[PDB]
Amino acid sequence: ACNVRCGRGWQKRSRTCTNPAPLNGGAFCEGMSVQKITCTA
Amino acid sequence: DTRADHNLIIRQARLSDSGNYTCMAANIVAKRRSLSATVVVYVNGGWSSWTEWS
Amino acid sequence: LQVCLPKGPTCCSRKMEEKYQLTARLNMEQLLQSASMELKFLIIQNAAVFQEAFEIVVRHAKNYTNAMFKNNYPSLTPQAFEFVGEFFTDVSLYILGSDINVDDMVNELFDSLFPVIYTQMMNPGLDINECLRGARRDLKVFGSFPKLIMTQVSKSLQVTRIFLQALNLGIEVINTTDHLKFSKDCGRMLTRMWYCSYCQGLMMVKPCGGYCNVVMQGCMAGVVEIDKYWREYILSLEELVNDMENVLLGLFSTIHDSIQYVQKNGGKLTTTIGKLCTLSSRRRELIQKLKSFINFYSALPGYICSHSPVAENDTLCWNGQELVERYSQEPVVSQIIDKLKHINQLLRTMS
Amino acid sequence: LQVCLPKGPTCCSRKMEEKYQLTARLNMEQLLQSASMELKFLIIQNAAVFQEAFEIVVRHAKNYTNAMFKNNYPSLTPQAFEFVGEFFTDVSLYILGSDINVDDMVNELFDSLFPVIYTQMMNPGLDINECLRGARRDLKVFGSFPKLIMTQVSKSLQVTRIFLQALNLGIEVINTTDHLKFSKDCGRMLTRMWYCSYCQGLMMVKPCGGYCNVVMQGCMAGVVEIDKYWREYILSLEELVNDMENVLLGLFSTIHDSIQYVQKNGGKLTTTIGKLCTLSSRRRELIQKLKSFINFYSALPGYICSHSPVAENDTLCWNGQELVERYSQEPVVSQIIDKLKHINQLLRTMS
Numbered sequence: 145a146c147n148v149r150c151g152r153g154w155q156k157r158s159r160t161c162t163n164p165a166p167l168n169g170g171a172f173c174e175g176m177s178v179q180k181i182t183c184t185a
Numbered sequence: 186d187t188r189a190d191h192n193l194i195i196r197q198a199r200l201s202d203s204g205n206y207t208c209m210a211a212n213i214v215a216k217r218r219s220l221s222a223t224v225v226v227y228v229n230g231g232w233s234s235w236t237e238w239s
Numbered sequence: 240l241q242v243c244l245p246k247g248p249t250c251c252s253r254k255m256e257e258k259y260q261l262t263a264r265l266n267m268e269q270l271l272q273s274a275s276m277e278l279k280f281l282i283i284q285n286a287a288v289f290q291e292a293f294e295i296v297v298r299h300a301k302n303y304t305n306a307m308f309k310n311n312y313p314s315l316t317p318q319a320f321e322f323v324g325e326f327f328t329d330v331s332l333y334i335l336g337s338d339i340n341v342d343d344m345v346n347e348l349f350d351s352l353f354p355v356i357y358t359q360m361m362n363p364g365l366d367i368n369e370c371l372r373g374a375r376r377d378l379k380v381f382g383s384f385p386k387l388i389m390t391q392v393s394k395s396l397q398v399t400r401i402f403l404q405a406l407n408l409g410i411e412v413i414n415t416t417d418h419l420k421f422s423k424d425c426g427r428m429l430t431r432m433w434y435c436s437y438c439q440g441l442m443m444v445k446p447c448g449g450y451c452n453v454v455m456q457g458c459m460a461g462v463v464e465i466d467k468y469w470r471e472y473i474l475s476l477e478e479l480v481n482d483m484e485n486v487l488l489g490l491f492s493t494i495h496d497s498i499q500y501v502q503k504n505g506g507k508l509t510t511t512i513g514k515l516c517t518l519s520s521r522r523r524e525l526i527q528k529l530k531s532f533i534n535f536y537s538a539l540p541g542y543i544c545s546h547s548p549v550a551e552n553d554t555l556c557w558n559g560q561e562l563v564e565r566y567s568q569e570p571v572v573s574q575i576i577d578k579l580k581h582i583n584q585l586l587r588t589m590s
Numbered sequence: 591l592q593v594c595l596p597k598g599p600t601c602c603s604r605k606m607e608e609k610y611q612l613t614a615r616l617n618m619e620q621l622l623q624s625a626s627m628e629l630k631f632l633i634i635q636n637a638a639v640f641q642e643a644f645e646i647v648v649r650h651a652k653n654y655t656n657a658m659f660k661n662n663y664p665s666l667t668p669q670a671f672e673f674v675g676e677f678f679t680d681v682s683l684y685i686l687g688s689d690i691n692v693d694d695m696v697n698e699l700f701d702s703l704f705p706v707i708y709t710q711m712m713n714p715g716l717d718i719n720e721c722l723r724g725a726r727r728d729l730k731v732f733g734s735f736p737k738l739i740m741t742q743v744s745k746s747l748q749v750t751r752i753f754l755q756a757l758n759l760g761i762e763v764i765n766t767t768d769h770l771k772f773s774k775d776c777g778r779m780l781t782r783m784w785y786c787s788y789c790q791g792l793m794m795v796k797p798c799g800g801y802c803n804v805v806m807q808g809c810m811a812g813v814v815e816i817d818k819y820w821r822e823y824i825l826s827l828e829e830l831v832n833d834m835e836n837v838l839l840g841l842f843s844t845i846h847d848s849i850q851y852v853q854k855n856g857g858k859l860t861t862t863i864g865k866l867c868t869l870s871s872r873r874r875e876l877i878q879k880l881k882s883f884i885n886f887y888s889a890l891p892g893y894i895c896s897h898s899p900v901a902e903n904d905t906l907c908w909n910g911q912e913l914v915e916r917y918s919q920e921p922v923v924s925q926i927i928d929k930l931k932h933i934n935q936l937l938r939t940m941s
């Protein structure tokens with residue numbers, strides 16, 4: 145939900161590296177883990 | 186053994202000999218049969234240790 | 240029919256039996272997801288928060304080191320910013336599990352730091368650069384400071400790296416729980432327990448508590464064996480939390496003192512070289528919240544039966560085949576246990 | 591010590607124990623070879639004799655076909671000798687187990703036979719050879735004769751080939767018996783039963799009959815399971831013997847009649863082509879002698895104990911650890927059973 149009720153707000157989306165999770169020095173997930181977009185309420 | 190990615194692995198051609206192996210997919214809609222693979226186990230010819238001279 | 244044992248007539252065909260089987264599979268998966276969702280979201284939240292917090296710590300420490308370079312050694316900037324940025328970039332890459340050598344980080348840091356110190360602070364006035372880099376280690380100009388920082392930061396960075404990997408593997412196994420495919424026999428038993436009563440024309444009859452118990456203890460015989468390893472995982476994580484913020488934040492003081500130490504012997508050094516050339520609170524709350532789920536795998540069949548519609552009284556209930564007055568009475572699991580054993584060994588070896 | 595249970599003192603070290611173990615291995619292998627030698631030589635002799643007898647039959651049949659070509663169709667020689675020799679060479683190669691196509695033998699025979707018939711018998715007077723070879727099959731000049739010979743000879747040649755393959759596989763499994771390596775536990779038990787009495791200073795004491803029985807039934811638990819399949823092998827071979835000499839020897843009459851048949855329509859054929867272009871006794875004695883060894887695998891531990899030095903009275907004997915007054919009381923095998931199952935199915939399908 146947009147944290148700010150009136151004006152510029154925020155919306156977050158998480159993307160974890162757990163399917164599968166790296167083990168014994170496996171290469172970690174490539175790119176970004178969080179996504180943020182500006183919203184107007 | 187049956188694998189999660191639909192594969193039939195045979196380690197030794199002894200406990201599972203030749204045959205017409207066929208893959209069949211089953212669903213709530215219907216069933217579908219794949220083209221049967223003719224898996225034949227072959228034994229290569231192996232001579233013998235020499236005998237004594239007559 | 241191949242699932243619904245036909246005692247009398249029946250209101251359902253074979254295709255309706257397949258529909259009931261698929262709905263049984265989906266209902267079981269939904270119940271497992273509902274059981275695992277709270278713990279999954281707890282560990283996901285904590286993994287994300289700790290990752291961002293460690294990145295904040297690394298950024299703040301790089302900023303503090305850069306600021307103290309700007310303030311105390313303006314003659315070493317802007318080259319100081321380059322090697323500090325490279326050092327803390329490699330720091331973050333190591334924290335996030337990349338193959339980085341800590342000794343190599345510190346050694347490249349001092350290798351880059353010594354030539355600018357020599358050219359700007361000791362002998363004011365690029366091709367000779369490698370001779371200075373070699374003399375740095377050959378003459379041990381920084382004394383014991385490089386090995387001190389090496390151990391100081393390796394000890395904390397390794398425990399942090401293993402903490403993050405442990406959180407991620409817990410997320411992985413909790414994700415595995417709700418996708419556990421079961422036997423065909425269990426599919427048919429769940430179909431009988433949940434739906435086969437509808438084939439006999441009953442509308443609101445629920446299965447017996449004891450029948451749910453026998454069915455659940457029937458197909459969860461493998462999943463319950465994970466409980467020992469999950470408990471050991473929880474306890475080993477508790478062993479590990481009982482470290483990296485203080486070290487990275489004192490790095491600037493250590494580097495400043497090392498620069499003073501090198502400047503102390505400038506007389507001999509210049510001539511020889513001229514000739515020669517709230518975190519702990521968060522992990523505590525996380526462990527105290529994680530200990531509330533130590534019974535997760537052992538209480539799981541109890542959850543499935545206590546959240547499915549069942550006749551607890553075992554009176555006027557469905558026993559899988561008839562309405563009774565009283566009731567009569569690995570590969571994926573192996574991978575879960577393998578990864579739990581691996582992470583538990585890795586945990587226990589650290590502390 | 592790791593084999594000799596030291597109850598009192600001991601007269602032997604660990605190296606002497608290893609020597610006793612290797613001598614136990616050699617003694618067991620020698621006993622198995624002595625048990626298997628009579629049957630091995632029987633099957634080897636019969637395989638060799640039947641091979642030579644079949645080769646004699648094939649040579650005599652080729653000679654008879656060549657003689658009837660010399661006598662009845664001199665115009666077809668010497669080309670007739672070439673295709674007859676190639677045909678019977680491929681016959682023998684098929685009998686001896688080589689990948690030869692029977693239909694291809696007959697078809698190449700008639701393909702080679704037709705052009706010389708056309709050039710020397712029908713139209714007297716190298717590049718046009720292939721047009722005649724194609725016309726042979728395109729116009730079906732030989733009628734049903736090729737398919738008649740095809741089935742006639744395929745039926746006999748397949749049973750003879752499988753007879754020889756069965757003899758060879760029997761040789762193989764009987765050869766494997768005396769090379770059967772055993773478990774390490776059995777090695778130590780045989781060392782105790784045969785030699786560990788010498789480590790306790792006893793000179794002529796023999797092991798108890800019951801102790802030999804328990805040891806042998808201990809390490810031959812796998813070998814005894816072969817007995818069912820060996821019995822089925824013997825009986826299936828008996829099923830098969832209850833055929834090829836008469837066929838190969840009547841081949842000349844069949845070919846002569848086919849040549850007459852082709853010459854019968856020469857009028858139309860020439861114009862169209864000009865425009866277009868004691869054995870049975872031996873196998874019976876072999877089966878009757880082979881049925882005397884049907885108990886070979888079941889009587890094998892009895893043989894090992896009855897041919898090893900043992901105290902049959904079970905009085906004043908060695909029990910593996912002490913001298914008593916009275917006694918208290920596999921991958922290669924899988925391969926043997928697999929090949930026996932295969933050859934038995936092949937046998938039963940033939941007859």
Ligand SMILES: *[C@@H]1O[C@H](CO)[C@@H](O)[C@H](O)[C@H]1NC(C)=O
Pocket residue numbers: 204205223
């Ligand atoms: C297998 O398939 C072949 C051809 O694809 C066929 O001739 C044979 O009779 C089949 N039957 C089996 C292996 O049972």
Ligand SMILES: *[C@@H]1O[C@H](CO)[C@@H](O)[C@H](O)[C@H]1NC(C)=O
Pocket residue numbers: 232233234761762765766769
């Ligand atoms: C018996 O086994 C031995 C092992 O060397 C082998 O060399 C010999 O040829 C065998 N006899 C056969 C194959 O019939």
Ligand SMILES: *[C@@H]1O[C@H](CO)[C@@H](O)[C@H](O)[C@H]1NC(C)=O
Pocket residue numbers: 302303305306307309310
């Ligand atoms: C550190 O970071 C701040 C911004 O967060 C910046 O204003 C400051 O100049 C830096 N300190 C230095 C470069 O001395």
